[PDB]
């Protein structure tokens, strides 16, 4: 029980959870367990998720996303420091009206990455699945932000960088915290 874990447990006792690294499978499993446990303890209070993440896998992000949506409580997502790639997806996935960006946070939107490795017959399947995943990613981003899927597709072709105010205008977040 190191200092980091001690403080994190203390915060978890106050329904605050963190996402501060790549979205691996381990990080997603930890976050999903935290959300399930918090929901079991109480299904009426909110859960705050702080996002300082440079991105990562899509399967892990989707595990976290489904666990967030299915939880009876409301997940309020605060973008602190950086919300890139999958972190952006999870930030914009928070309960509508409960998505915040700290004033100097930055957000990054771009299309996924991957690799093709096997033979031609396997690369065909990989490419098909890439198309499916990209289409679904853009669909969900457009749903979250309210922008047309065409605009999301055009903007994500390469790294698109947003500040807090630009993100608020776009639709990633509903507020900029200041106090």
């Amino acid at each position: 029980l190191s200092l980091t874990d001690s403080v994190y447990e203390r915060l978890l006792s106050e329904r605050i959870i963190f996402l501060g690294s790549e979205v691996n499978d381990e990080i997603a499993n930890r976050l999903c367990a935290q959300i399930l446990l918090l929901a079991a303890e109480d299904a009426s209070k909110d859960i705050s998720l702080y996002i300082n993440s440079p991105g990562g896998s899509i399967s892990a992000g989707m595990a976290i996303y489904d666990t967030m949506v299915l939880a009876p409580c409301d997940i309020a997502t605060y973008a602190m420091g950086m919300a890139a790639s999958m972190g952006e997806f999870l930030l914009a996935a928070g309960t509508k009206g409960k998505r915040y960006a700290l004033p100097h946070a930055r957000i990054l939107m771009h299309q996924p990455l991957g690799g093709v490795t096997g033979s031609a017959a396997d690369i065909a399947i990989q490419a098909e699945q890439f198309a499916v995943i990209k289409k679904e990613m853009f669909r969900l981003n457009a749903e979250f932000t309210g922008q047309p899927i065409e605009r999301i597709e055009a903007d994500s072709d390469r790294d698109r960088w947003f500040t807090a105010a630009e993100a608020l205008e776009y639709g990633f977040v509903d507020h900029i915290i200041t106090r």
């Binding site: 990455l113 991957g114 093709v116 033979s119 031609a120 690369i123 065909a124 490419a127 198309a131």
Partner: protein, 190 residues
């Protein structure tokens, strides 16, 4: 340790009889050497057949296509002999010889299989769409070349090469990749 003196290298003697030896991997360096030799021999005697010996495990696709275009371009007929093995790209080169003049020793094996990626290409999903399209184009080009030089529909070639297919010399003759299986010419044997 090959026996030669200052240069009577046996490969020099073979080349002096219009024989090119593809005994290594099919890459850019060997490809360029092969095309230089084919052009030189065509210039030396355009109307005398050039012989190619294929004991190679295959290799790159663009190098294969370089060698294939040079073999088809030159004025002289190309006689291919598969000795040992002709696997992957080399198989096409074996089947690309002039019809009739494609041969293999009795214990040679020909391996035909679809193009595969040497490692992982990484990048945005768009770059991967481009690369996957290119790989499909290359595979279809291979099927078409073999269909042209064996007499079989590209669909049959695609079905057969979906997974490694190994053919003895006789099975290669039936498949159309070669035309004759050399018969041993030892004198004491007869």
């Amino acid at each position: 340790i090959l026996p030669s003196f200052i240069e009577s290298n046996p490969y020099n003697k073979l080349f002096e009889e219009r024989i090119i030896f593809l005994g290594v991997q099919v890459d850019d360096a060997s490809a360029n050497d092969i095309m230089a030799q084919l052009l030189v021999l065509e210039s030396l005697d355009p109307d005398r057949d050039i012989t190619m010996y294929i004991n190679s495990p295959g290799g790159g696709f663009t190098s294969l296509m370089a060698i294939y275009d040079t073999m088809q371009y030159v004025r002289a007929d190309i006689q291919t002999v598969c000795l040992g093995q002709a696997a992957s790209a080399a198989a096409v080169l074996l089947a690309a010889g002039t019809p009739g003049k494609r041969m293999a020793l009795p214990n040679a094996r020909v391996l035909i299989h679809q193009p595969s990626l040497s490692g992982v290409i990484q990048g945005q999903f768009s770059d991967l769409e481009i690369q996957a399209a290119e790989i499909e184009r290359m595979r279809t080009l291979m099927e078409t070349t073999l269909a042209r030089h064996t007499g079989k529909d590209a669909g049959v070639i695609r079905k057969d090469t979906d997974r490694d297919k190994i053919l003895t010399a006789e099975e290669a003759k039936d498949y159309g990749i070669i035309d004759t299986v050399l018969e041993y010419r030892k004198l004491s044997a007869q």
